[PDB]
Every structure is written in structure tokens, then in C-alpha cells.
């Protein structure tokens, strides 16, 4: 399970979103149709950013606290959307792998 | 005390299994001897006795714990400890018989089985072939408890032999082959149990011959083909090391570069 | 020290064709060529990998005409030829290199009858070779992140739930290309060396550096010229993006050829 937090400010501001997990095995990513914003592998070491947000957004994680971050600098009215956290894992499903989402946090710029 | 690597079936994942097998390989060989990008285990010739073995401690959901001993020169299980009793496969020769006296010295009860640890004798003692002995987290759990209770009168010999067959493949063979390790990660990933398919069986049977063909190849090309099997029964031949690079992770030492 | 054997073997390369002494003529200076792999005892396709780093057909030597890029490769008497022009190294990543010139054996076109040459090494498909008696590429499933399978869908490649689908079968050719089983004219291709470039399926025509791959001992699939590996983007299969990416070793870069 995943829950968001930290979601109004003007254009050019800053806001940091948190993502508290209940249970490190999971690749984690941010989404905002829903569109990919940023993602990071389980151990870290791989961070992958959407082209729109590249050079402005920073995804980080910390597996000893089980929390995922999204630093959002130099925001534009284009960033206004619902921002979800997402995780992917190894179990069994119709996908063939697990996808756990969040409830979403509103950001308005 | 010989190096110890730990694995538990309680809540085991793809990742925890991978960390475990990686850790085992890191203590089996230094990685400095590599032939055609495939690591070689230490030469038995020149290897001091205090570096001859590594220990693999297994535990399960019931917190039963058992410690396998692995010969670093071939990654194979030579025996195991449970509580204050230790058991060993019948050694092939006198030196291997002497070398295992350096394992589990503190243990108060030591026994050597009359049978060796080769699959052929374990299969006849288990009453079944590897092709029908299911593998996975579950079988590893049950193998751990059966090994633990053998000191007690509660584990019959076929179940013991079956437990050896499970541990050897899931630990020793997975260390020898990324391919077999991926087969085990498949079972753990979906919480399924499954007997190994012929590709796994032929790889296990060919490990020695594969090591010799690779180390004595002329720039990767083998002097003679080695016959493997696909996951269906179908057989094919390998003439070059190139297809085996992602398949084999360790080789027994055969000769000097 | 290990014995060094001298196996007789075919050399398979670009588009799965065999290294061939043209028309079976063993006159000094006759060209080496690509040709469909024979299934007989004809000497012009069977090569002895000799202990002196020589590659011999019917007693004569695979010999480069010179030490400049683009000169052709011929058959020549081993004693008469310049010694350095008869010496080759077969590298574990499919390269056959002439040490004196540091130039690499190459088939600059993909048609039967193409004159073999030596070229500057760029680790392209046109320079990928395999010493083997197998004349058929190995067809396999390629399992990766979360146990999902590499899947071809026209031009696009992604990873999806495995099901024993010809779209999930792949032909591993001796030239290092990875081809969709349903259309062997096409190749797993990275249009360029940039990190995060999306890997796709395109014609094997150019036989480029972006089309050559090696399964490494660590489980990664490596594009040799760039040094980047295949990567399920963001470790998220739902993005349907397989990219080139620098090596970090996490599970979205681990693959296994399940034959
Ligand atoms: C790949 O296929 C080729 C062709 O089928 C094999 O070449 C054949 O190899 C055998 C054994 O290496 C050769 O026979 C040997 O001849 C020598 C010389 O007389 C003799 O001393 C040996 O006792 C043996 O009989 C045979 O001539 C050769 N055929 C050719 C060159 O047309 C080759 O071995 C295969 N390679 C592998 C690695 O399996
Ligand atoms: C392809 O394989 C060759 C042969 O193993 C590699 O060349 C060697 O690479 C090592 C490691 O950097 C060097 O120490 C050697 O000096 C190189 N030459 C030889 C003759 O061994 C080559 O790097 C590989 N190419 C790629 C792109 O991986
Ligand atoms: C397995 O568990 C035991 C007991 O909890 C640990 O001591 C092992 O750690 C390893 O051995 C010690 C002596 C030290 O060298 C440490 O660095 C090692 O990692 C542990 N084994 C592993 C592989 O973590
Ligand atoms: Cl080459
Ligand atoms: Zn080599
Ligand atoms: Zn005896
Ligand atoms: Zn058998
Ligand atoms: Zn002529």
C-alpha cells in the first residue's frame, strides 16, 4: 500500500511530494490519461525521467525509511495535475507482475 | 571459522534469493581467474585447508536451521551440521576424507554415510529421479526440516536423500549456472514448485565436461561438441563458448591459462 | 597449461552466411566470401583453427591483402604469405581481428558472394563471427524483469507476460544480431548510442553497431560499441519501452535466454 502527501504555489516555485509505503523490492515511479513522470529501480542506481520534466524534477528513494520523494523545481502551469505514486513488483497477476498505486495528491500551479 | 552465507525461506523473494546466490559465488572463488569471461573456481592444487570450504546456513518458517558445507573447488555439498550432530557424504579418496575433519570441529557427533553425494546414488536412495523431485521455496523448506530432524529418529533415508537432491540443485547448481539460478528464481517468483526440465538436468550432468571444453578451447572453439537439451527434450550441440557465457557462472579448475 | 586444440569448424557471420573460399578455388589470392552454409565435407567452408593463430582451409591460410581499411581477404599459401597477414585472434565477443593491422574481418554487404574485407573495428553486425558447425541460429525465448518475456510487435519491442507466441521467439544469429523469429530480415536495433534511446526492430540491412548484442556473464545484454545494456525503462513493463542504458545491474537489466 502507498499513500501520497505534500501536494498550491505560483509558477516557478518548489514543492516536494512524499510517498509513505506500508511494507525495497519495488521499483517506484511517479505518474501525473496517466503519464509517466519519473521512475527509479528498487536498489536505486537507475533513475529514468520523462522528457517533459527532465532537468526540473528529481526522484529519490530511501529503503530504510520506505518513502519515495519527488522534488519539483521550476514548476509551470503545465505541471498542474493529479500526481500518483506507483510501484512494480515480482508477484503473479494478469499483468504477470504486481502494480500498486496511490490515492493521488492534487497540485495546482 | 569458515565463511558463512545465510538464506531463509521465510519470506524469501526473487531479490533475497539472488543476493544469496551472488554471495555464495563471491565466497566460492575470488573472480580473478576468468576464462572467456567465465569465472574459474580455485585450483585444488595450492589451496590451503583453511580456505577449502564455505558454510551455507539455511533456515525456514519454523526456525529450523541447518548448515551445509561446500567444497570451494567444485561448489558441491560435502556434508552438513544440524544441532550438535554433523553428517558427511562418503568421501571419494583419503585426502577428501582428511579435509572434512576440519569441518564442524566443535560438533560432538560426527558421522560419515556409506553413500556418496552423487545424484545417481541419491536418486536410488530417494526412490526417484531429479526429473520428478520438485524444486522451489516449499521443497527447500521441507528439505531443511527433514535434514534437521535426521538426528532425531524422524527422517527416513529416502526423504533425506530427496532433501539432499533439493539443496544441491537449489544451492550448488544454481551457483554453477545463472541458467539454473534463473529457473529457481522462476519458482520463487510465482510460489510454485516444479521438477527441473531436461535442460537443467543435462546442464548439471555436463558441468565437468563443459569446464574442460571451455578451458581447453582454442579461442572459445571446442575441440569436440557438447550435447545439451532444450526445455523440451530436443537435443542440440554446442561448439563454442559464446552461447555458454550467460549460462555458466563457475567452472571447476582444469588447467592453467 | 591447457592443451590448445585445432578444431575444424565453419565460421558463420553476417545474416548467418558462412565464410567461403570463392568457387572452391585455392589459387593464391582468390577471395574469401560470404556464402550460404553448406552441409557437406567441402573444404572451402571448413576452417582449422591452428595453434599458431592461423585459420586454414584445405591447407592454405586466411590472409588479408593489406593493413589498410577496406582491402579484401584472400586464401594464400601459409609459408609464402607475409606472416603477419595470416595471423588472427578470435575474441569471445565475436570479433576476428588481424593483430598487426588491428583491423577486423568484415562483410560490408549482406548478399551471398560478398567479398570479405578487413575494416576498422566498430563492433558492427558486419564484423560478428562465430566458429561453429551449427548452421542455424539458436531460437530462444528471452526472459527478463519479473519473469516477463521480450516480445516483438512489428517495429516495437517490449516485455510482457510469457506464453509459449511466436512474437516472443528470437533467433540469435552468429553475427551477433537478435532477430524476431517471425521475420529474420529484421533486427533488434538501437538507432544510436545515446542513453535512453528506445530499442526497436528494423531491417538488418545496415548491419550497424546498434544491431549487435552479446549476452554477458552477469546476465546483461550488451551493445558492444556503446557499452550500454538493454534496460526495461524505469523498471516498469507498462511503459513498453526497452532502452539502452549504462550498466547498473538492477533487475530491469537482467535477462536470461530460456532455450
Ligand atoms: C565440424 O564438422 C567437420 C566436418 O564434418 C568436422 O571435420 C572433421 O573432423 C574430423 C575429426 O576432427 C576429421 O577426422 C580426423 O582426421 C585426422 C587426419 O586424418 C585424423 O588423424 C583423425 O583421427 C580424424 O579421423 C575430419 O577429417 C574432418 N573432416 C573434414 C575436415 O572434412 C569437424 O571435426 C567438426 N568440428 C567439431 C568441433 O565437431
Ligand atoms: C572483446 O573481447 C576482447 C578480447 O577479450 C577485448 O579486448 C581486451 O579487453 C581487455 C579488457 O579491457 C584488455 O585488457 C585487453 O588488452 C583487450 N585486448 C585483448 C587482445 O585481450 C575487447 O575489449 C572486447 N570488446 C568489448 C567492446 O567488450
Ligand atoms: C550470516 O549470519 C551470520 C550471523 O548473523 C553473520 O555473521 C554473517 O556475516 C558474515 O560473516 C561475518 C563473520 C563477517 O565477515 C560479515 O562481514 C559477513 O557478511 C552472515 N553472512 C553474510 C554473507 O551476510
Ligand atoms: Cl571480426
Ligand atoms: Zn576467449
Ligand atoms: Zn571407503
Ligand atoms: Zn538421470
Ligand atoms: Zn584463379
Q: Which of B15, B186, B220 to mutate to test the interface with C (most CBs of C within 10 A)?
A: B220
Say which residues have a Cβ less than 8 Å from residue B159's Cβ, sequence separation at least 6: B126, B146
B76 is catalytic: yes
Q: How many residues does chain C have?
A: 259
C194 interfacial to chain A (CB closer than 8 Å) = no
C92 CB near ligand 2 (under 6 Å):
yes
Q: Which CATH superfamily is domain A2-107 in?
A: Immunoglobulins (2.60.40.10)
Looking at the CA of residue B237, tell me the nearest atom of ligand 1.
39
Q: Edge-to-edge strand order for the sheet containing C96-98?
A: C89-90, C96-98, C103-106, C117-119
Name which of B241, B77, B59 is nearest B161 in CA terms: B77
**How far is the C-alpha of C188 from the C-alpha of C194, rounded, in Å?**
16
Any bridge partners for residue C119, and if so which?
A: C104
Closest ligand, as measured to the CA of B92: 6
Q: Whose CA is nearest to atom 14 of ligand 1?
A: C8
Q: Residue C13 burial (CB < 10 Å; 0-12/13-18/19+)? A: buried
Q: Of C161, C249, C250, which is closest to A95 when you measure between CB atoms?
A: C161
Cell representation of residue B22: 551472488
B191 interfacial to chain A (CB closer than 8 Å) = yes
Q: Residue B199 burial (CB < 10 Å; 0-12/13-18/19+)? A: buried
Q: Whose CA is nearest to atom 7 of ligand 2?
A: C91
B17 is catalytic: no
Question: Residue B160 belongs to what H/E stretch?
Answer: helix B157-167
Please report, for chain C, the start and end positions of each structural domain, with discontinuous segments joined by +. Answer: 1-136, 137-259
Looking at the CA of residue C8, tell me the nearest atom of ligand 1.
33
Tell me if B221 and C90 make a contact (CB, 8 A cut-off). Answer: yes
Any bridge partners for residue B138, and if so which?
A: none
B2 is catalytic: no
CA dihedral C258, C214, B210, B167 (to 10 degrees): -50
Confirm if B60 and B9 have CB atoms less than 8 A apart.
yes
Biggest distance spanned by C-alpha atoms of chain B: 54
Name which of B118, B66, B112 is nearest B87 in CA terms: B112
Q: Whose CA is nearest to atom 21 of ligand 3?
A: B5
Question: Please, which experimental method was used?
Answer: X-ray
Please report, for chain A, the start and end positions of each structural domain, with discontinuous segments joined by +. Answer: 2-107
Helix, strand, coil content of chain C in percent (nearest 5): 15, 35, 50
Q: What phi and psi, each to the nearest 5 degrees, are found at residue A2?
A: -140, 140
Closest ligand, as measured to the CA of C130: 4
Cell representation of residue C216: 554477458
CA dihedral B171, B176, B182, B185 (to 10 degrees): 10
Name which of A56, A27, A54 is nearest A40 in CA terms: A27
Catalytic residue from among B119, B148, B150, B253: B119
In this structure, are strands C200-203 and B235-240 parallel, antiparallel, or unpaired? unpaired
**How far is the C-alpha of A17 from the C-alpha of A22, rounded, in Å?**
17
B119 is catalytic: yes
The resolution, in angstroms to one decimal, equals 2.3
Amino acid at each position: 500500500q502507498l499513500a501520497e502527501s505534500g501536494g498550491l504555489v505560483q509558477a516557478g516555485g518548489s514543492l516536494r511530494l512524499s510517498c509513505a509505503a506500508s511494507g525495497s523490492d519495488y521499483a517506484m515511479g511517479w505518474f501525473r490519461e496517466r503519464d509517466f513522470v519519473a521512475g527509479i529501480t528498487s536498489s536505486g542506481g537507475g533513475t529514468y525521467y520523462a522528457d517533459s520534466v527532465k532537468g526540473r524534477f528529481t526522484i529519490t528513494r530511501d529503503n530504510y525509511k520506505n518513502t519515495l520523494y519527488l522534488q519539483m523545481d521550476s514548476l509551470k502551469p503545465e505541471d498542474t495535475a493529479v500526481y500518483y505514486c506507483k510501484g512494480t513488483a515480482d508477484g503473479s497477476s494478469s499483468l504477470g507482475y504486481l502494480e500498486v498505486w496511490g490515492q493521488g495528491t492534487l497540485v495546482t500551479v | 571459522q569458515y565463511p558463512i552465507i545465510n538464506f531463509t525461506t521465510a519470506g524469501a523473494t526473487v531479490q533475497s534469493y539472488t543476493n544469496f546466490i551472488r554471495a555464495v559465488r563471491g565466497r566460492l572463488t575470488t573472480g580473478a581467474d576468468v576464462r572467456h569471461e567465465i569465472p574459474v573456481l580455485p585450483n585444488r592444487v595450492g589451496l590451503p585447508i583453511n580456505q577449502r570450504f564455505i558454510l551455507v546456513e539455511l533456515s525456514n518458517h519454523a526456525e529450523l536451521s541447518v548448515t551445509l558445507a561446500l567444497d570451494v573447488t567444485n561448489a558441491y555439498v560435502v556434508g552438513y551440521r544440524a544441532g550438535n550432530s554433523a553428517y558427511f557424504f562418503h568421501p571419494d579418496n583419503q585426502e577428501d576424507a582428511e579435509a572434512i575433519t576440519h569441518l564442524f570441529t566443535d560438533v560432538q557427533n560426527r558421522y560419515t554415510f556409506a553413500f556418496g553425494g552423487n545424484y545417481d546414488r541419491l536418486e536410488q536412495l530417494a526412490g526417484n529421479l531429479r526429473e520428478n523431485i520438485e524444486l522451489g521455496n516449499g521443497p527447500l523448506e521441507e528439505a531443511i526440516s527433514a535434514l534437521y530432524y535426521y538426528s532425531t529418529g524422524g527422517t527416513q533415508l529416502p526423504t533425506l536423500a530427496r532433501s539432499f537432491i533439493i539443496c544441491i540443485q537449489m544451492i550448488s547448481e544454481a551457483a554453477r549456472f545463472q541458467y539454473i539460478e534463473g529457473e529457481m528464481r522462476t519458482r520463487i517468483r510465482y510460489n510454485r514448485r516444479s521438477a527441473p526440465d531436461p535442460s537443467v538436468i543435462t546442464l548439471e550432468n555436463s558441468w565437468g565436461r563443459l569446464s574442460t571444453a571451455i578451458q581447453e578451447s582454442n579461442q572459445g572453439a571446442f575441440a569436440s561438441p557438447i550435447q545439451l537439451q532444450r526445455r523440451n527434450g530436443s537435443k542440440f550441440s554446442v561448439y563454442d563458448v559464446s552461447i555458454l557465457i550467460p549460462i555458466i557462472a563457475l567452472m571447476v579448475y582444469r588447467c592453467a591459462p | 597449461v591447457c592443451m590448445d586444440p585445432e578444431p575444424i569448424v565453419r565460421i558463420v557471420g553476417r545474416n548467418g552466411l558462412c565464410v567461403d573460399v570463392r568457387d572452391g578455388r585455392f589459387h593464391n589470392g582468390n577471395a574469401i566470401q560470404l556464402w550460404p552454409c553448406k552441409s557437406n565435407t567441402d573444404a572451402n567452408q571448413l576452417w582449422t583453427l591452428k595453434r599458431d593463430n592461423t585459420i586454414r582451409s584445405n591447407g592454405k591460410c586466411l590472409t588479408t591483402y593489406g593493413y589498410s581499411p577496406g582491402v579484401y581477404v584472400m586464401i594464400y599459401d601459409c609459408n609464402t604469405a607475409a606472416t603477419d597477414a595470416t595471423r588472427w585472434q578470435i575474441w569471445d565477443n565475436g570479433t576476428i581481428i588481424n593483430p598487426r593491422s588491428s583491423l577486423v574481418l568484415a562483410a560490408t554487404s549482406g548478399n551471398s558472394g560478398t567479398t570479405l574485407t578487413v575494416q576498422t573495428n566498430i563492433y558492427a553486425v558486419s564484423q560478428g563471427w562465430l566458429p561453429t558447425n551449427n548452421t542455424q541460429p539458436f531460437v530462444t525465448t528471452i526472459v527478463g524483469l519479473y519473469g516477463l518475456c521480450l516480445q516483438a510487435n512489428s517495429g516495437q519491442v517490449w516485455i510482457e507476460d510469457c506464453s509459449s507466441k511466436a512474437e516472443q521467439q528470437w533467433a540469435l544469429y552468429a553475427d551477433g544480431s537478435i532477430r524476431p523469429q517471425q521475420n529474420r530480415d529484421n533486427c533488434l536495433t538501437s538507432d544510436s548510442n545515446i542513453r535512453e534511446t528506445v530499442v526497436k526492430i528494423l531491417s538488418c540491412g545496415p548491419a550497424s553497431s546498434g544491431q549487435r548484442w552479446m549476452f554477458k556473464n552477469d546476465g546483461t545484454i550488451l551493445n558492444l560499441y556503446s557499452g550500454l545494456v538493454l534496460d526495461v525503462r524505469a523498471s516498469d513493463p507498462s511503459l513498453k519501452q526497452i532502452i539502452l542504458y549504462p550498466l547498473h545491474g538492477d533487475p530491469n537489466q537482467i535477462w536470461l535466454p530460456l532455450f
